[PDB]
Design a protein around this ligand. Structure first.
Ligand SMILES: NC(=O)C1=CN([C@@H]2O[C@H](COP(=O)(O)OP(=O)(O)OC[C@H]3O[C@@H](n4cnc5c(N)ncnc54)[C@H](O)[C@@H]3O)[C@@H](O)[C@H]2O)C=CC1
Ligand SMILES: Cc1cc2nc3c(=O)[nH]c(=O)nc-3n(C[C@H](O)[C@H](O)[C@H](O)COP(=O)(O)O)c2cc1C
Ligand code: SF4
Ligand code: SF4
Ligand code: SF4
Ligand code: SF4
Ligand code: FES
Ligand code: FES
Ligand SMILES: [Mg+2]
Lengths: 59, 230, 43, 217, 433
């Protein structure tokens, strides 16, 4: 359960799990997450910006 | 005058003849839950979310279509109305797809908000869900018809406001579908308003897709300059 | 008088257009239809 | 069961707006007669009869026929699409020469409609959604054709064949594929819905006119 | 001895549909020889008030299945005209499983229906009559058209109908395979070239109906008995059956009986008497009877313990937690899978929903899936109460009564055969480990 450095995960096919729903950005108590998104070249819902300010983060 | 007297939770209300239960309720500052009712479209009465109990009446009535009678006491927060709302929301959510994270309507969805306010908090649906194929109606309105709740707001807007009779329903029962039945584009100077009137993410803006969420946008009230209408 | 025989047999020679031919024949017996004042609700 | 047919039309060479359909002059006279049955200003009430007449003339309903009906009645084509996709008696795909419809609802189910369905299946070698390779027979399942007393019953091209045994329906199929015209009705020796036990009711001769009439009339 | 306590054993001369089995000529000559079209001009000249009074005194209730008082319903059209035409609509859709009476009335006694149309239209001031018959009844509709042509030639309808000076037209409109189109507002939509989706009430058809005009929708049996009621008077019809359950009724008996048949009998005849008298009894004996659906698929079933003493009227069957419905008796013996039959009925309702409103459109399919699982036994006992609650939600929250007709059989099955469902679930759990 230990909370360490943040990471972004993939599906077993290598596809990004992130779907740019921006729930983490909304819930983030320190406003440490910055997200921008657009439809990918194949029409998928993916992020173009996903930043975590680790000096704003409270882990 | 010609006004009649009705009660909303025991409070006297003076309304014109032909006023519906929903309008009488909104005169005292309560908004009846609704999906299919739009005050600028014709009355449909299909979604059944607006069912409300009238005192001394065994059966609940549809507040959007029922004119209120003199002396009626509308009980908007009784057990009957709440259980009717919960049942209707259950039936609405039985086949709805788990698409909220990928739906653009998320955060400004009437289905979500009215589920949070008037529905239950869990599911007892143990079957498989239905899935329908998408319709291409142009490069402006994105179409994901699995999220459709069959309100028919879009059909009524196309018929009455835009003057275009290209939208309708095909099939019946659980298989009823909203579309054109043929590959056809709903291209009109007012075609983009079906995105707004649609309560759910079945119809969404294609240029706006995936870019933002409603809670992070800042609202600036301004005036359009693309014509002389203002 | 006898109830032995079945007397509904004229329907065994009915064709695809029987109902509509009967409607065509009946069309001359009908009264002038009422009018709503316009040609269509979209007029 | 889930309906096999779809409710979205995709253009094909066999079925597309350029498919040739038109009404014969006799059919146009019939359409005129049908249209004169409704008040002026309400021409759209003729959508169902004219669509059914188009199906009866063509055998099925291509999208060209539906567009033609919409044009004749001055109705938007989407309303005709709604009508054609709502009512199950309309054929939006070609059907065989003899459309066999077997009722499997509970009143007919209790009288072994499964036997009739299986006998038809093994006589034709097709399923409940297929058409014979010679395009003569199409077999489907329907709901309560309105002859529950005469169960089990089958409808073939607006003709009723009831009180059926597997051998009876097979014989009907043989004489259908032989070009003959089978007599519609029960096959158990009873003419109609009367009891087979010997006509327990309506035995006395019917009373003459004015027999029970009250005074002052 | 007034105030009869035993009902049934109706005589032939008291019967109305004297050609139910098509044993006589259905044409105009045979109907006239059988008493039809007899001084109907005098009936028309009596005025709408006299006909409405006779119907009210008769105590006739709607034979479509709801049992609404016919006189009160028809009196709603007794208003002065406001410029719109007035219409009578005869419901010949006949959608319930187990129901076959209207088909026989149309095919064998069409002139009775035509004369009833004329009498009812004069009573309600209707300009014309539209008879909406299901498209599966093609030969029946053609026979009706032939009878209408015979009436037109004889001057019985049309201009100066029967010499009474009242103009009346009779039209036949065919639907295309839709059970929902039997519901009056859905039927009105189907006539006007639209989808068979019911309308919300109010407004009632007496205010806004077909083409937006005042309209009355009446069943074929309700219409076809009015001329005989007016000829013999309200009192004669009233004597038969219990109080508020007056008159004669057509009964369809199908399922597990030796002689499935359609018969005419007095209203309050006990179900056991009717079954053992006209249907030849239950297959395998009366002790082999398991359950009976008395009024078509929309009414809940009742077990054997109830069928041996129940009367076939509205009030008695209401007291038995069911309904008279269309008087369509479906009999099931002890060899019948009671769960499978109700599942088939629920499948019928799932395939017949028009899909307009949420409760029917989704809940009926949900109950269909649940009952399909119940037939195999794949579910759990708490799902029985879950399904009961689902049915309650559907009932009374829908636009029309198709939701009621889908919910009620499930409620009856759960009420009367819960141990069967639990036993099947327990067997499935054992076999599948
Ligand atoms: N004969 C058949 O093939 C079928 C029959 N049914 C039966 O139909 C019954 C339900 O039908 P419904 O029309 O929904 O019943 P209903 O009680 O709502 O209406 C019955 C008739 O009385 C009129 N009516 C009722 N209340 C009225 C009011 N307050 N003011 C003015 N008019 C009023 C209605 O307009 C209608 O014509 C069911 O019980 C079912 O048994 C159902 C399916 C098929
Ligand atoms: C789903 C549904 C289907 C119905 N189908 C029929 C039908 O096929 N024939 C009929 O006479 N009534 C049918 N009814 C009941 C009608 O409402 C009724 O016939 C109509 O109100 C006529 O009233 P009456 O019984 O006084 O003649 C149906 C009702 C519902 C809810
Ligand atoms: S935006 Fe955040 S919450 Fe949403 S999928 Fe991506 S990482 Fe998860
Ligand atoms: S339409 Fe509303 S409820 Fe449905 S997936 Fe989108 S946000 Fe969620
Ligand atoms: S697309 Fe939207 S407005 Fe149209 S029927 Fe579906 S939910 Fe209603
Ligand atoms: S209950 Fe069913 S059939 Fe009746 S209006 Fe609603 S969806 Fe249509
Ligand atoms: S808001 Fe009234 S039924 Fe939809
Ligand atoms: S159950 Fe077969 S005709 Fe109705
Ligand atoms: Mg939207």
């Amino acid at each position: 359960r230990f909370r360490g450095e943040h990471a972004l995960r993939r599906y077993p096919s290598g596809e990004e799990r992130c779907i740019a729903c921006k729930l983490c950005e909304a819930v983030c108590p320190a406003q440490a997450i910055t997200i921008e998104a657009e439809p990918r070249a194949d029409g998928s819902r993916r992020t173009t910006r996903y930043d975590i300010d680790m000096t704003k983060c409270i882990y | 005058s010609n006004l009649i007297e009705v009660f909303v939770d025991g409070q006297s209300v003076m309304v014109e003849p032909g006023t519906t239960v929903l309008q009488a309720c909104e005169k005292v500052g309560m908004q009846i839950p609704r999906f299919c009712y739009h005050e600028r479209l014709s009355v449909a009465g299909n979604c059944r979310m607006c069912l409300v109990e009238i005192e001394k009446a065994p059966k609940v009535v549809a507040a959007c279509a029922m004119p209120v009678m003199k002396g009626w006491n509308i009980l908007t927060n009784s057990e009957k109305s709440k259980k009717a709302r919960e049942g209707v929301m259950e039936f609405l959510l039985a086949n709805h797809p788990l698409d909220c994270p990928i739906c653009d309507q998320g955060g400004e969805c009437d289905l979500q908000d009215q589920s949070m306010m008037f529905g239950s908090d869990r599911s007892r649906f143990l079957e498989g869900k239905r899935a329908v194929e998408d319709k291409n109606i142009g490069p402006l309105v994105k179409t994901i018809m699995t999220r459709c709740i069959q309100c028919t707001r879009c059909i009524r807007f196309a018929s009455e406001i835009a003057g275009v009779d290209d939208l309708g329903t095909t099939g019946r029962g659980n298989d009823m579908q909203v579309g054109t039945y043929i590959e056809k584009m709903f291209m009109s100077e007012l075609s983009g308003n079906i995105i707004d009137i649609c309560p759910v993410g079945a119809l969404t803006s294609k240029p706006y897709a995936f870019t933002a969420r409603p809670w992070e946008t800042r609202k600036t009230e301004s005036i359009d300059v693309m014509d002389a209408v203002g | 008088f006898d109830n032995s025989t079945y007397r509904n047999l004229q329907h065994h020679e009915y064709s695809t257009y029987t109902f509509l031919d009967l409607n065509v024949e009946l069309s001359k017996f009908r009264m002038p239809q009422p009018s709503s004042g316009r040609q269509s609700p979209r007029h | 069961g889930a309906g096999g047919a779809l409710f979205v039309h995709r253009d094909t060479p066999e079925n597309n707006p350029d498919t040739p359909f038109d009404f014969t002059p006799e059919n146009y006279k019939r359409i005129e007669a049908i249209v004169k049955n409704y008040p002026e200003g309400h021409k759209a009430a003729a959508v169902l009869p004219v669509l059914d007449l188009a199906q009866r003339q063509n055998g099925w309903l291509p999208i060209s026929a539906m567009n033609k009906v919409a044009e004749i009645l001055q109705v938007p084509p989407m309303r005709v699409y709604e009508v054609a996709t709502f009512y199950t008696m309309y054929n939006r795909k070609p059907v065989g020469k003899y459309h066999i419809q077997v009722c499997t609802t509970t009143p007919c189910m209790l009288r072994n409609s499964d036997s009739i369905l299986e006998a038809i299946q093994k006589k034709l070698g097709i399923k409940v959604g297929e058409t014979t390779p010679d395009k003569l027979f199409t077999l489907i399942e329907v709901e309560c054709l309105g002859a529950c007393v005469n169960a089990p019953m089958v409808q073939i091209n607006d003709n009723y064949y009831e009180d059926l045994t597997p051998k009876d329906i097979e014989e009907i199929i043989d004489e259908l594929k032989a070009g003959k015209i089978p007599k519609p009705g029960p096959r158990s020796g009873r003419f109609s819905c009367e009891p087979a036990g010997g006509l327990t009711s309506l035995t006395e001769p019917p009373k003459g006119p004015g027999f029970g009439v009250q005074a002052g009339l | 001895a007034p105030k009869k306590t035993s009902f049934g054993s109706l005589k032939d001369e008291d019967r109305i549909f004297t050609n139910l089995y098509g044993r006589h000529d259905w044409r105009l000559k045979g109907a006239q020889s059988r008493g039809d079209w007899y001084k109907t001009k005098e009936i028309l000249l009596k005025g709408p008030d006299w006909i409405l009074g006779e119907v009210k005194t008769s105590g006739l209730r709607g034979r479509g299945g709801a049992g609404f008082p016919t006189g009160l319903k028809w009196s709603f059209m007794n208003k002065p005209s406001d410029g719109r035409p007035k219409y009578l609509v005869v419901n010949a859709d006949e959608g319930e499983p187990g129901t076959c009476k209207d088909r026989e009335i149309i095919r064998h006694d069409p002139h009775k229906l035509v004369e009833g149309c004329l009498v009812g239209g004069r009573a309600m001031g209707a300009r014309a009559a539209y008879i909406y018959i299901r498209g599966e009844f093609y030969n029946e509709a053609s026979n009706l058209q032939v009878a209408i042509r015979e009436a037109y030639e004889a001057g019985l309808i049309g201009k100066n109908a029967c010499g009474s000076g009242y103009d009346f037209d009779v039209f036949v409109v065919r639907g295309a395979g839709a059970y929902i189109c039997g519901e009056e507002t859905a039927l009105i939509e189907s006539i006007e070239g639209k989808q068979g989706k019911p309308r919300l009430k109010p407004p009632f058809p007496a205010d806004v109906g077909v083409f937006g005009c005042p309209t009355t929708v009446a069943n074929v049996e309700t219409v076809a008995v009015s001329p005989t009621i007016c000829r013999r008077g309200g009192a004669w019809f009233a004597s038969f059956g219990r109080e508020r359950n007056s008159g004669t009724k057509l009964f369809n008996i199908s399922g597990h009986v030796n002689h499935p048949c359609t018969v005419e009998e007095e209203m309050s005849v006990p179900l056991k008497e009717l079954i053992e008298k006209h249907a030849g009894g239950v297959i395998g004996g009366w002790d082999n009877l398991l359950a009976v659906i008395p009024g078509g698929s929309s009414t809940p079933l009742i077990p054997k313990s109830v069928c041996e003493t129940v009367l076939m009227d509205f009030d008695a069957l209401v007291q038995a937690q069911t309904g008279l419905g269309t008087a369509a008796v479906i009999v099931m013996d002890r060899s019948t899978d009671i769960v499978k039959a109700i599942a088939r009925l629920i499948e019928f309702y799932k395939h017949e929903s028009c899909g307009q409103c949420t409760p029917c459109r989704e809940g009926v399919d949900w109950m269909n899936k649940v009952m399909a699982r119940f037939v195999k036994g794949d579910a759990r006992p708490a799902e029985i109460d879950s399904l009961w609650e689902i049915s309650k939600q559907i009932e009374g929250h829908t636009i029309c009564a198709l939701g009621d007709g889908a919910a009620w059989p499930v409620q009856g099955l759960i009420r009367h055969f819960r141990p069967e469902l639990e036993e099947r679930m327990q067997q499935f759990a054992l076999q599948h480990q």
